[PDB]
A paper describes a structure:
In bacteria, topoisomerase IV, a tetramer of two ParC and two ParE subunits, unlinks daughter chromosomes prior to cell division, whereas the related enzyme gyrase, a GyrA2GyrB2 tetramer, supercoils DNA and helps unwind DNA at replication forks. Levofloxacin is a broad-spectrum third-generation fluoro­quinolone antibiotic. It is active against Gram-positive and Gram-negative bacteria and functions by inhibiting gyrase and topoisomerase IV.
We have co-crystallized the [name] topoisomerase IV ParC/ParE breakage-reunion domain (ParC55; residues 1–490) and ParE TOPRIM domain (ParE30; residues 390–631) with a precut 34 bp DNA duplex (the E-site), stabilized by levofloxacin. The X-ray crystal structure of the complex was determined to 3.35 Å resolution, revealing a closed ParC55 dimer flanked by two ParE30 monomers. Residues 6–30 of the N-terminal α-helix α1 of the ParC subunit again embrace the ParE subunit, ‘hugging’ the ParE subunits close to either side of the ParC dimer. In contrast, the [name] complex was formed by co-crystallizing the topoisomerase tetramer complex in the presence of a 34-base-pair pre-cleaved DNA in the presence of levofloxacin. The methylpiperazine at C7 (using the conventional quinolone numbering; C9 in the IUPAC numbering) on the drug extends towards residues Glu474 and Glu475 for S. pneumoniae and towards Gln460 and Glu461 for [name], where the glutamate at 474 is substituted by a glutamine at 460 in the Klebsiella strain. They both exist within the same crystal in the two different dimers in the asymmetric unit. For [name] both of the carboxyl O atoms are pointing towards the Mg2+ ion at distances of 4.86 and 4.23 Å. The CC25 (the drug concentration that converted 25% of the supercoiled DNA substrate to a linear form) was 0.5 µM for the Klebsiella enzyme and 1 µM for the pneumococcal enzyme.
Author numbering:
A (entry chain G): 400 to 530, 538 to 540, 561 to 623, 1006 to 1109, 1113 to 1482
B (entry chain A): 400 to 624, 1003 to 1109, 1113 to 1482
Amino acid sequence: GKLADCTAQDLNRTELFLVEGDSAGGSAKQARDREYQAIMPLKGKILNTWEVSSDEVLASQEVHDISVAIGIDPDSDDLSQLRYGKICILADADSDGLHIATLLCALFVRHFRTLVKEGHVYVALPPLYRIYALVQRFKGLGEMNPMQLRETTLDPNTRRLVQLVISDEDEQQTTAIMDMLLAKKRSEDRRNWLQEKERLALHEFTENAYLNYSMYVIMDRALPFIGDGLKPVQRRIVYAMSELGLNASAKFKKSARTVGDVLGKYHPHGDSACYEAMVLMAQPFSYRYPLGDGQGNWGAPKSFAAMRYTESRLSKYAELLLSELGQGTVDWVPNFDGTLQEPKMLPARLPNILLNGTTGIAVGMATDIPPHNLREVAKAAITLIEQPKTTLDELLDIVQGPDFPTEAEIITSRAEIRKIYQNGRGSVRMRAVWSKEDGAVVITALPHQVSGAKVLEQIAAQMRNKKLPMVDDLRDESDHENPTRLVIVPRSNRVDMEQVMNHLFATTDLEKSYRINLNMIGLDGRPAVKNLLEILSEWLVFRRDTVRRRLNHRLEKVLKRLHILEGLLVAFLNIDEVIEIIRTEDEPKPALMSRFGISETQAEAILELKLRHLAKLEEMKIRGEQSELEKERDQLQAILASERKMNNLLKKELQADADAFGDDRRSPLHE
Amino acid sequence: GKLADCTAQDLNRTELFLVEGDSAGGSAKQARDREYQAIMPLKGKILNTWEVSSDEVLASQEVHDISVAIGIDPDSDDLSQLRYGKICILADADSDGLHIATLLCALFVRHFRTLVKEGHVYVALPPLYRIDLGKEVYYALTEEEKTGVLEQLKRKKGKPNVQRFKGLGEMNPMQLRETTLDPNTRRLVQLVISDEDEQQTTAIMDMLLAKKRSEDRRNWLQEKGDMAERLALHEFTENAYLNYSMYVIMDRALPFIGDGLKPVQRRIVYAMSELGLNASAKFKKSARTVGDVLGKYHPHGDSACYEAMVLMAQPFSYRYPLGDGQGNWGAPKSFAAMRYTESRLSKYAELLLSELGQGTVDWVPNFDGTLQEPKMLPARLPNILLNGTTGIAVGMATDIPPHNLREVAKAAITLIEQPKTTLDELLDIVQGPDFPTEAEIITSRAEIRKIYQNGRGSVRMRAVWSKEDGAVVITALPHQVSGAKVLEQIAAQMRNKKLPMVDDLRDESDHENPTRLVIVPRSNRVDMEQVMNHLFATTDLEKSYRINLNMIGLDGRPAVKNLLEILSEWLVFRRDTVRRRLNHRLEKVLKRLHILEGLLVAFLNIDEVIEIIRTEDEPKPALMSRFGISETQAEAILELKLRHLAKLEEMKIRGEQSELEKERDQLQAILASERKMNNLLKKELQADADAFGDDRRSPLHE
DNA sequence: CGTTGTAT
DNA sequence: GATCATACAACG
DNA sequence: CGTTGTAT
DNA sequence: GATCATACAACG
Ligand SMILES: C[C@H]1COc2c(N3CCN(C)CC3)c(F)cc3c(=O)c(C(=O)O)cn1c23
Ligand SMILES: C[C@H]1COc2c(N3CCN(C)CC3)c(F)cc3c(=O)c(C(=O)O)cn1c23
Ligand SMILES: [Mg+2]
Ligand SMILES: [Mg+2]
Ligand SMILES: [Mg+2]
Ligand SMILES: [Mg+2]
């Protein structure tokens, strides 16, 4: 179908390239030899055909096209109808590229063992840098010129293609190693595996390739950092918005601009997934504390408008992550192009990891953190600072539990919640809020991530199957005033609507379960499941560090300014002689230093003084500023040397921030 | 199908909204009443069912879904199965929105006349501006209405917020509800076709939506150059289609004679200039520049924008591209995504972007009003003839072939030297169109002369082939010829037994030789010339090209112009822009000289100056009085640094003063002489011709 | 019908 | 990320 | 089986 | 500009 076949059938000379990107496929087809080189693009990530039947594999259109292209059936085929001498897999140097490579290797090993054993499976190794090396630095196959692609991966005289082989006595390890990687079950074995950690062995390639993707997804994709509770994509988005000046007080700008900036500066991925994550951050029903200010259609409790239409802006809450940024609080690593710099963390003032929470899926592990109440978590942190010996139960007496932005009751025993937080893993269930008035049941609040229309459809279908003769009629009185209003009117006032309600809790989606897995990337740099006490403590460490760094930065600034000011006052005290030196001495810079006992910095400061600064008001301003800066310097130096004053400062900032960004408990606890 | 129906069947109360955007449809569905309001989105421009059969209309999925939604067949139906009391068309305030409106009006008028006559067709008028000062909030569909609102708000506590809606997708659901949905606050007009007006309605709508005619639309556009509860459909349709027509003509399809660019292209190259993506700069991701174009200047889609950009980057599409990309930008077709490709302006683009910040072009504010945008670009060479353009508007179109830079430059210089130069004399310089595809342009020089004399015509190209040895080898194809399509054509022609003379067809097109098509004959006695003529007549080895020199002149109105008119008018543009540059630089030099004189005066009496500074409260007016010095010079003295009190600084200032005096003399001299001005223009033209010069790619033959 | 190029 | 139907002029 | 959220 | 199949962990 989408194949671009060659003008030859002679094996041991013909080559079939499987390209990752359709665009990359176009570039490859533009540079092939055509006399023996055919190019077939595989649109997107293929299926995991390691636990699929030999007949079920033909169902997937990608694997189907691959099968038809190779001219072999997923069973013993043994050449014969092999249309190409060599089948080479060509994907870019991404971790995702190695993932696709490992997938194709799984498909080939499991369903075409004869082909791999005969030595027809090849891996194309593209260069990572060009000055070629396996400086320009190619981000992908789509980004590199056709001729470059030809020289790098196509032309045999200049190519670097390795042959993947599964020799005897290594075939046992191959089938064994590849199993734990691509098996839908196991999973824990993959956790432990990640924990412990011209021709090439297929088992060696698969093990090293899958490690790259696993580590990349775990560290730089699915799992959030304990500091600001953000994933790389989200951090890049909010920072690129900060750079775009899109503050909460600023005017709205088109989403396409900020997205294009995120891609063009920091995020080397697609615009679709980026704008998707952004839209997710902008939704009040998706995010407890969004960041998170949009104009236009940003969805509803679903799908939204295009980025070419919507306009965006950071929330006032986002300040908690973006204030104190340019004050030497976070470290900076350079971006993919090396043209700009990017913050590794954000100077969070409140533990966003607990506030907003996160849900993600990596390789071998996942993360599921529920949102919480800002005031409660803040109070818990402050309590943790005041009394460091505070146990988990006392913290639980402050933080009731998860706080979802969907109202409704969280029906879960306080002991069960206590266990969930003490062990870091568990499940929390929510139930819709309903009231009888009058005699009829009206739902006024739905659980988190409940469609509402789907619930109505569920009850309606259940009625249609004659399973609910107790209910006379179902009406949706959900208007602008009342967002969620689902009325259920029963036939006769003798029917137990409570029993029907419990039945709806058991059958419909009025009651929902939520996975809880407090897994995150700690300050150590490695992912780990942590309990509430550990999270609050470690975050307290992070905050303490960042605050300390801010204080030191400000201290240095103040000191330098004080030095320059002292120099300036010295200048003013003897301005006539200074100006005289300027207009009578050859190179007055070192002359000023000698005559007044002044540093080169202070000398340059004097030299940079303006004539309008010779007025008296300027000397007054400078002296006053000197006094103020002296007091501030004393304060900063004082707080820096006392652990008590430092902790007190942290407490002050926590309480102050808790008041400004505070919110009442939305989802109450019940049973 | 995509309908979000309401929970009622009671007519004279139920309303059906036809939304332009699926996203806007989402916003509308999110804000409807559901008790009587149903929402159906129409994704994209509908079909023009004004010359289509009553059955052919049902073939188009959009019109089909609309028909099923209304519960009426495109023939006489007469209510009965009418599912909704009112059918309202909802589109954003674009000219494109009014186009969609006119299209839906065509569909309803021709195929559902009974429905429109009964009064069920409604047009929803959305607000263009939103003004809010405090708890007060106002909406306005007219700019005059907006300025009216602002005048009233001038009595209240200041600082009002104007929003300006670019479309329905960008406005919040509740705003859409209050503005166009909620009956108590909406502004929906009823479209009616009363008796004796139905004849005029059918007449006016015909010339607008008829595939033929066209010239009538030209003449109509030529001659053509508050609200109530109900409006005449013919009055609405004629004015709506006028808006779209004028918008497409002026701000879409037709290029401006100055820089030879369309609004999209101009916005792209300017946004690249602002992004600092110069020819000497490093490549940046295309998504960045596209996102900038959309986020700053262009209020349209990213796809079509990146499409135009990619088209500008192609060496085979653009004679002089601008136009520097890395990655897959297509081949002689389609390309890679913007998330992968990297971009940068060409060295040629300098000709449009140099002299930008020198007061050469006018500036209009952007859609948000936050930034400014150039109306034109200070072109140094007539890009309108160099690159050429192809576009389709309403009533008219434009087809301009590319030309050779050296030839056109030489023609311009010749036009400056001898202003009485005729068209033939210019034609002796400019041979004709110059395509970036090699190959011969087999067209009589007289025919070309006529084509250029009338501004309209057609130029034909033919592939370049040679016999070696005994076999025919094609080495160059005409512009926009696929080659693979040519191969497929000849091969199919062979398969149909139409070519028994030809033994074999081979594609020896490699990296070294881009186009190499070998045709081997059976036996050496067959006349391959006859076969070649047959392939020229049948296959795509010979291609015709439309020529329609229509463009927007300096007058501001589109018109077909001949080569002499184009070159002359462009010479006017260039002369004017150069004059503006010279004047700008002159003003700068003069001001700097003034400031320098002030500074020297200050240096001459520095002690007294410092005295005034340290003895007079606010010395600015004191310095002015004591030395006879302007406020600007006073501020200049006040901003002097102590390190500038040295002698070397005064020396530098004096030397710069001398230089600036000489430069001022030169600038003022060139400004007052027509001969010196013309000499400057000639010098710059010749200089540009050398640096950006190109050899003739497509030779002329017969 | 089949193109061409900015638009939805 | 590639693809699908549409408007509009006007020639082969 | 069907979700959830960054990825091809 | 909306849509379609995929990986990955893991619960109901
Ligand atoms: C604005 C959207 C509107 O919808 C579109 C299409 N439709 C889908 C099938 N429908 C039956 C008819 C409408 C379409 F076929 C192509 C495009 C398209 O190429 C495009 C672009 O920006 O390049 C943008 N759009 C398109
Ligand atoms: C990798 C690209 C190309 O393939 C994609 C899809 N396929 C099309 C149908 N095929 C049968 C299977 C693959 C797809 F259904 C969705 C997406 C998608 O949502 C997306 C994104 O960036 O958000 C990007 N891609 C997608
Ligand atoms: Mg990639
Ligand atoms: Mg997607
Ligand atoms: Mg619009
Ligand atoms: Mg398109």
